[PDB]
């Protein structure tokens, strides 16, 4: 059809992939072995001819432990075995190991396996890349992969789903360095990237699901709910965001500023007692509540470059228009100067799906708002400050220089980040 | 990374190394025969890290003294060790670092490296080396450092971990020990990635003051060492709830290559279970440190804390946070989130709840100052210097090592006073 290949890099990226592909299977009625009782989800699944549906997906990690569980677990028959790729020793939370020393040992193998998936696409749109910012592999090998894919697939789009580190969810002291390094090397190679702040997901599981200490499974199933909201248009033949290129068109007027904020509603515990299903207006208003954002930042503070609303379920178009109209009269929505102020609307009419027996209640209508807002600069600034504190002492730098990286790449990355903060500042200065 | 290759050299090295295998064998359910008698698959999930499948410790026993191999071989767990793994001489080192590094040790070292090599080549993926030795004597100190440098030459990309016992006259009033330990510390700053500073001075003080032992023995001190080594290796040995090898640990613990000397601690100390506040308070208490340094005299660059036993994680996170919050002065503010907590649900033998502490603190300069002052006292009267130069050792190596250790001290001092 118009195929997208999903690539999952490092522990975070693999485990979020697991949740995402779990949910996709549920959404399309595909079983853990690829069976089910020209279909639109053929963008994300190949179809053999015996009725086996195979995810267009690659899993890569520089050590085998996480991917070994995929090869042994519930979905061991879902993916091609040659789709699941492991090395022997990981990047030790070290971008430079992931990008240079260890990553170069396996980059060509990864590209060969990607090439074989691509050769089974009639009209490949591009790639969705899932990875952590803090991991040595998630950061370092992702950057290497993104550079190589820009050369080998020059005209294909590449989108990122990346995990923003947070002290509340197993970060490490070097992660800020890794976040900046990957962001700098990837920036020119990614058309659009959706950041997930681990503290926001953590906050939401704690508040909305009453999970005091969210597990990765808790966090990743919520994450995959937002990811599914974002990729639904590619799997259900939408009217909005019908292909990867359209994400840039609809969300990214300025190529460097390509980090839209995802706000999702409603997140409701399956343990909550009976209650009336929330209306289109109610879930639309909730899109403007900071507590529902995927990245912690103050939107009241910023200005909008672009905004899409992706609805799922029992959603009547006139009710969306009335809800949006209400928002514009009641909320102070400011667009930056030279960007059209229309909200783009997508409606997927299929009921939103949850993992049976998970934490998330099944709802009659859900919405994911994607807003490219300058408020997300506050998240870059938080990262940059942590980087600055360590780097002013050159703390931990020697670990990177010893693994094939020149010390100048640290300041080169930081400078790029500083221009990115100024990009945000200048695009939204009154 | 999976497997770890363990080396124990010298008297001290082999006695603490033997105690280490007893504790962790008991923890993993490996009996004195090498037969598994444990009650949980958790005990076996990472047996591979320290054992080769019956389970045989991946340990190489080394001494230039013959009898210490006799004493371990008939020790409680002396039969688990591979016989071929015993590499010993007959001469001995005579508390002389230069005999261990340059003569008697140099003659035995290639034999050890052949055993190391065949243990390495059997490893799926080698995670690194760990060495138990004392720095105050001749074999563990001099030949241990020679081994360290040889391994670093043959395995440049592997982690070198060491548990090094620091001399104290409280325990061994032998006046050449500051010489041997300064020569060794010089080796350590250049060639190890991680060194746990096991300070005999602190061991004695803990036993004497805290444990109320009138005359602490090597068994009493080794009781604290073995419990410390079990605790710092807990995340290597038991299923996490943490996907990290020795390298990932070094990366996050060591902000500057030379500052890789850790102050280990343990709670509760022993020879009723504690609450989580108790555990946390004691774990940061000077009395619980295995290095004779007051942490309130310095600042923490990095801290790792490992809790063992069934306990409330929200209580732990809160305890750790308020300690950092209440005592922010003691924590370097230009390493965000430099206090990391991990938890393991399997407690050590004879305990429901424990906490192990790994601190990279600038207060450890007090340990090196102590040694340096004793080295300078001896060196300036030039006593016994000929024992060393007579083995071919250049005298300049003495002043070189002293300079390196004093550079270490000031390097801690500037990060102690660095602001952000």
């Amino acid at each position: 059809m118009r195929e997208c290949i999903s690539i999952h890099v490092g522990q975070a990226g693999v485990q979020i992939g697991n949740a995402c592909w779990e949910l996709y299977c549920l959404e399309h009625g595909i079983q853990p072995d690829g069976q089910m009782p020209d279909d639109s989800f053929n963008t994300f699944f190949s179809e053999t001819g015996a009725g086996k549906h195979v995810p267009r997906a690659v899993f890569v990690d520089l050590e085998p432990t996480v991917i070994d569980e995929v090869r042994t677990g519930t979905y061991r028959q879902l993916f091609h075995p040659e789709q699941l790729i492991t090395g022997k020793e990981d990047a030790a939370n070290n971008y430079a190991r992931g990008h240079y020393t260890i990553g170069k040992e396996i980059i060509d193998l990864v590209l060969d396996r990607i090439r074989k998936l691509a050769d089974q696409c009639t009209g490949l749109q591009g790639f969705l890349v899932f990875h952590s910012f803090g991991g040595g592999t998630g950061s370092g090998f992702t950057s290497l992969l993104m550079e190589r894919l820009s050369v080998d697939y020059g005209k294909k789009s590449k989108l990122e789903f990346s995990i923003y580190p947070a002290p509340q969810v197993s970060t490490a002291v070097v992660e800020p360095y890794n976040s900046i390094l990957t962001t700098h090397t990837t920036l020119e190679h990614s058309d659009c990237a959706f950041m997930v702040d681990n503290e926001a997901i953590y906050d939401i599981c704690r508040r909305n699901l009453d999970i005091e200490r969210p597990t990765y499974t808790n966090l990743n199933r919520l994450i995959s709910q937002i990811v599914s909201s974002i990729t639904a248009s590619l799997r259900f033949d939408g009217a909005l965001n019908v292909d990867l290129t359209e994400f840039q068109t609809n969300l990214v007027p300025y190529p460097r500023i390509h980090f839209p904020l995802a706000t999702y509603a409603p997140v409701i515990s399956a343990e909550k007692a009976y209650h009336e299903q929330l209306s289109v207006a109610e879930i639309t208003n909730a899109c403007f509540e900071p507590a529902n954002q995927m990245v912690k930042c103050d939107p009241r503070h910023g200005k909008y470059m672009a905004c899409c609303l992706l609805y799922r379920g029992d959603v009547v178009p006139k009710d969306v228009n009335a809800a949006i109209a209400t928002i514009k009269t009641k909320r102070s929505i400011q667009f930056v100067d030279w960007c059209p102020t229309g909200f783009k609307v997508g409606i997927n009419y299929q009921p939103p799906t949850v993992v049976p027996g998970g934490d998330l209640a099944k709802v009659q209508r859900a919405v994911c708002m994607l807003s490219n807002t300058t408020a997300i600069a506050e998240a870059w600034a938080r990262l940059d400050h942590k980087f600055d504190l360590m780097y002013a002492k050159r703390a931990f730098v020697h670990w990177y220089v010893g693994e094939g990286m020149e010390e100048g790449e640290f300041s080169e990355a930081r400078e790029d980040m500083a221009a990115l903060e100024k990009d945000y500042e200048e695009v939204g200065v009154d | 990374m999976r497997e770890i290759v363990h080396i124990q050299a010298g008297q001290c090295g082999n006695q603490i190394g033997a105690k280490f295998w007893e504790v962790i064998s008991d923890e993993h359910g490996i009996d004195p025969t090498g037969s598994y008698h444990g009650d949980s698959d958790l005990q076996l999930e990472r047996i591979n890290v320290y054992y080769n499948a019956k389970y045989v410790p991946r340990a190489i026993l080394v001494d230039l003294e013959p009898g210490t191999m006799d004493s371990v071989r008939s020790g409680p767990f002396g039969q688990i060790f591979r016989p071929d793994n015993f590499v010993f001489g007959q001469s001995g080192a005579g508390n002389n670092w230069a005999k261990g590094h340059y003569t008697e040790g140099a003659e035995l070292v290639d034999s050890v490296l052949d055993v190391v090599r065949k243990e390495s080549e059997s490893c799926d993926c080698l995670q690194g080396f760990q060495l138990t030795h004392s720095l105050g004597g001749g074999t563990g100190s001099g030949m241990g450092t020679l081994l360290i440098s040889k391994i670093r030459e043959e395995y440049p990309d592997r982690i070198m971990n060491t548990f090094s016992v620091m001399p104290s006259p409280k325990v061994s009033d032998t006046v050449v020990e500051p010489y041997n330990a300064t020569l060794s510390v010089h080796q350590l700053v250049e060639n190890t990635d991680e060194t746990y500073c096991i300070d005999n001075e602190a061991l004695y003080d803990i036993c004497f003051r805290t444990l109320k032992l009138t005359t602490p023995t090597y068994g009493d001190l080794n009781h604290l060492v073995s419990a410390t080594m079990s605790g710092v290796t807990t995340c290597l040995r038991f299923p996490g709830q943490l996907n990290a090898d020795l390298r990932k640990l070094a990366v996050n613990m060591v902000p500057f290559p030379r500052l890789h000397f850790f102050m280990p601690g343990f709670a509760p100390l022993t020879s009723r279970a504690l609450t989580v506040p108790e555990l946390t308070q004691q774990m940061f208490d000077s009395k619980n440190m295995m290095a004779a340094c007051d942490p309130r005299h310095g600042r923490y660059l990095t801290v790792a804390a490992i809790f063992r036993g069934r306990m409330s994680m929200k209580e732990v996170d809160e305890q750790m946070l308020n300690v950092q919050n209440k005592n922010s002065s003691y924590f370097v503010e230009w390493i965000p989130n430099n206090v990391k907590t991990a938890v393991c649900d399997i407690p050590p033998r004879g305990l429901k709840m424990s906490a192990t502490f790994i601190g990279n603190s600038t207060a450890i300069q007090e340990l090196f100052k102590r040694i340096s002052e004793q080295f300078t006292a001896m060196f300036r009267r030039k006593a016994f210097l000929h024992w060393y130069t007579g083995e071919g050792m250049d005298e300049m190596e003495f002043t070189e090592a002293e300079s390196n250790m004093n550079d270490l001290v000031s390097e801690y001092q500037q990060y102690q006073d660095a602001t952000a």
Binding site: - | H186, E190, P257, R258, G392, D394, E397, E400
Partner: peptide
């Protein structure tokens, strides 16, 4: 006997 120099291990990084 040749001996180890200060900073000689710093070269690895």
């Amino acid at each position: 006997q040749p001996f180890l120099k200060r900073g000689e291990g710093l070269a690895r990084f």
